[PDB]
Amino acid sequence: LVGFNVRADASARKVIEAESLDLRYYSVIYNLIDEVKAAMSGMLSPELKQQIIGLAEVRDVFKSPKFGAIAGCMVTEGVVKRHNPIRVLRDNVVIYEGELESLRRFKDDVNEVRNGMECGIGVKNYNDVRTGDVIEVFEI
RNA sequence: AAAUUGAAGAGUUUGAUCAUGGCUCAGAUUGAACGCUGGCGGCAGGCCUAACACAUGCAAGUCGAACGGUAACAGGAAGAAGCUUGCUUCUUUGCUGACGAGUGGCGGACGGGUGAGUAAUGUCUGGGAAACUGCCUGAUGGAGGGGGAUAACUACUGGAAACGGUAGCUAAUACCGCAUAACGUCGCAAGACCAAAGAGGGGGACCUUCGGGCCUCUUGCCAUCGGAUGUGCCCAGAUGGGAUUAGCUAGUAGGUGGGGUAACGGCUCACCUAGGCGACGAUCCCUAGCUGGUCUGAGAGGAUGACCAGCCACACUGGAACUGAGACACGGUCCAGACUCCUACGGGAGGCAGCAGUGGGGAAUAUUGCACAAUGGGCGCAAGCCUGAUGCAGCCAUGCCGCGUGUAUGAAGAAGGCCUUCGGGUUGUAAAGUACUUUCAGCGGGGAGGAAGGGAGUAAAGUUAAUACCUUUGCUCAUUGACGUUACCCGCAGAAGAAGCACCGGCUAACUCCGUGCCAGCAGCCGCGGUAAUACGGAGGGUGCAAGCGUUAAUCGGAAUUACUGGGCGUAAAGCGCACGCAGGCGGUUUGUUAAGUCAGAUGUGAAAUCCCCGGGCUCAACCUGGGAACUGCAUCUGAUACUGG
RNA sequence: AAGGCGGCCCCCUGGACGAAGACUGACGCUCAGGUGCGAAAGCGUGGGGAGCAAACAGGAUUAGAUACCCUGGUAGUCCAC
RNA sequence: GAGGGCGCUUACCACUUUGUGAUUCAUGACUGGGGUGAAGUCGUAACAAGGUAACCGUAGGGGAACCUGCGGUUGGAUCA
RNA sequence: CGCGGGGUGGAGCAGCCUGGUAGCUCGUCGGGCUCAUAACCCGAAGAUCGUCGGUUCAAAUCCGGCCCCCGCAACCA
């Protein structure tokens, strides 16, 4: 609720103060035209990645009851993290996408795995694990 | 003579019926809104919502006959000059007609606004006793002799403003002693004690210190007892709902005494008693200003409390008192709160629920108008001044009432439209044509009443020394209307500028075609819509209203559907599963008594307006108005004693 | 009084009705609130438990059959408070 | 001197503050049942003796209407 | 090398420690009921009882191997 020039009425204050709202008055139109745009710019929710945190290739799949699969991995570059989103692609095209639920090496279940260290991975809603594909994890 | 001498039912449950029972309609009414439409006038009505907030103007002043007075403007004047020698401009001085600022008096407690608060320091009805009461009024007397101040003003000074600080100085009907003092207050009495003010108009001998004395009348001042009006106080009844609120109460209820008020009083305080209220509804909770009356109803009732009038309460919110006869003050003061405005930043200012007007809220409610001419209020001896009271005007079809938007003639009855079995029917005497009228609107011309008074003179009476003055009453002269372009009357032009809205299936007055096809849509209730739809939508025709017509909202009616008048509970809604029983309601029969209930009569009161009856006035009507009747009620007294109660 | 009460015997006890006459002298009727009673099922403690039978199990029927029918069977049905 | 004013002081009391209760209005993730809909799915519980007479109270059970037990009612057809 | 429970007819079971012609369900094919179908009812088909050796009168049921299915167990990252 904006005005070029306005004051709040006695009956107006009661409503604005009660429910959650915003009262902002602007002397000039330029300060207004800028912030409305600002409101709009914020509205946007784009994730374009998005730099990769780590890239890993999976080999020798294993079976798990909970996630349905565990794909053995070897990190070639970067560091793999738990809650950071991943992009699963085969032959340069993305077969599947998601966010990691469990990162586990052996029975350790460490939250982080560096490059050139044996690593393990599993995710829900991923049916088919094939060798030769590479999983790309990226921070946001 | 008359003055409540008045009362309707319909649709819808079923295949059909009767009953039961709700829903719905015809009616009146409205401070209305919205939709379509819209010519004039008279009278009325107009923020129902936000007791929301308010810019600006205006809404409370007035008296020079209380007072010192001049600063404005107006004259006048010794004396300056305008001097063109009677015309004059300015320097002066309140000399006076007046009058800014000031003291003083009376009014700012009325008039006007609102309904927040209040189920009672309210209202209504009817009564009480302990009181005050300006202005106006009757009665009887005073009105003597003094004193110290002060605003204005002057000088110095602080502030942006609001508004101040010093010291001077002065008047009075400002203020205070002193005297006087009862048919006054206190007191059994003896006694004791209390007030005040002048100001004007005119004038005969008489005269001064030329101010006046003195003469006279008007007016104001003081006291006391009254009248009238106003107000305070007390008691009884009535005046909303709720028990899904049953207990409430320490100034509480009373007593004594002191204090207190204008006055009675736990009004207040001390002490004492332990009461007081409550199921006949206390306490608590919700809501609300009360009435006359208004709307509805045959009535009894139901609903309601704008406009008019009476009472109350409030004045931004909470609290407080000061002044005053009156206020705990609507445009006063003080404090606190909320809020707003001004500021030179240090400080100031204000309160529309007065009249217009603005923002806001809302479906919705008007012009920042004219005039004090009339009625009425404040001040004044008056003249007069003030009066958003009031009288008027503007806006809105908001309502009521009136009138117009033409009258008469006009036929095979045209054209067009609509229906039709293509014969004709209809729109329809409707239109055109023909004469004719001119309300209203337009335009010119004329012209009541609302005006009574007040002003100069005059004359007579009462006054008085007086023909003055004063006051009353006659006379003449010249005058006073905001509305206003008034009402109304005459003239001119031409039918000329003036008709829309809803409805037509039954209830319910009004029927057909085409389009659509369980769609689009209608619908107060039943219920319409799938190929003939009088129910949708258009058309033609018709019905009902008419400057309105419909829709919505709203009260009562019909509703005997809360049934007092005036209903029900076996099977329709409704007998507690049964009994005992307090309170309560009701109670057999005789006598006497009582006389509360009940009945009778008398008296007072029941405001006016409204309603109703018969009249009167605006061309009629609405509207205004005279008189009556009515207010079915309350209270006091006196009776009656059958019935109820004791 | 209603709920309800049934073999036989005794004990304690309430009410109803009739006959006759005496006594009291309106002591009456109704009853919001209050109090008491109140089938069956159900609840608590402890008893009791033949028959019946919610639940539950099994056998059948049926398209299904958490039922109706059958074989069993716990609470309960019985006693005291 | 008397008397007054100011100041101080005491009483009453508005705003205000603190603690804890009561009550009422609005609103709340979610959840319960209720009402209303042209047509949907499952069955068929009631109306006939409705194919196990129904209903009332109660208790237990079950997708659902319901079923079952106990007592009560007739507002049960047939009685041959 | 590593646990569980099973192998009977087309499919799933019962017959088990209680060793003497293997019966009970769904399907299969017929028959019956109906106007007809579903449903239901009468019925017949259908077997080295996994496969062997042991053991015995006769062992479905008796033991142990070969072997298979399921069970969780596991490919437990």
PDB file of C-alpha atoms (C1' of nucleotides) in Angstrom, chain C residues 60-64, chain E residues 25 38-41:
ATOM      1  C1'   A C  60     -22.673 -73.819   7.222  1.00  0.00           C
ATOM      2  C1'   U C  61     -25.628 -70.586   3.880  1.00  0.00           C
ATOM      3  C1'   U C  62     -24.446 -66.792   0.245  1.00  0.00           C
ATOM      4  C1'   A C  63     -22.126 -63.308  -5.358  1.00  0.00           C
ATOM      5  C1'   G C  64     -20.409 -61.552  -0.465  1.00  0.00           C
TER       6        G C  64
ATOM      7  C1'   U E  25     -10.897 -76.129  -2.372  1.00  0.00           C
ATOM      8  C1'   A E  38     -24.516 -64.123 -13.513  1.00  0.00           C
ATOM      9  C1'   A E  39     -24.660 -66.759  -8.894  1.00  0.00           C
ATOM     10  C1'   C E  40     -25.738 -71.320  -7.016  1.00  0.00           C
ATOM     11  C1'   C E  41     -26.522 -77.009  -6.974  1.00  0.00           C
TER      12        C E  41
END
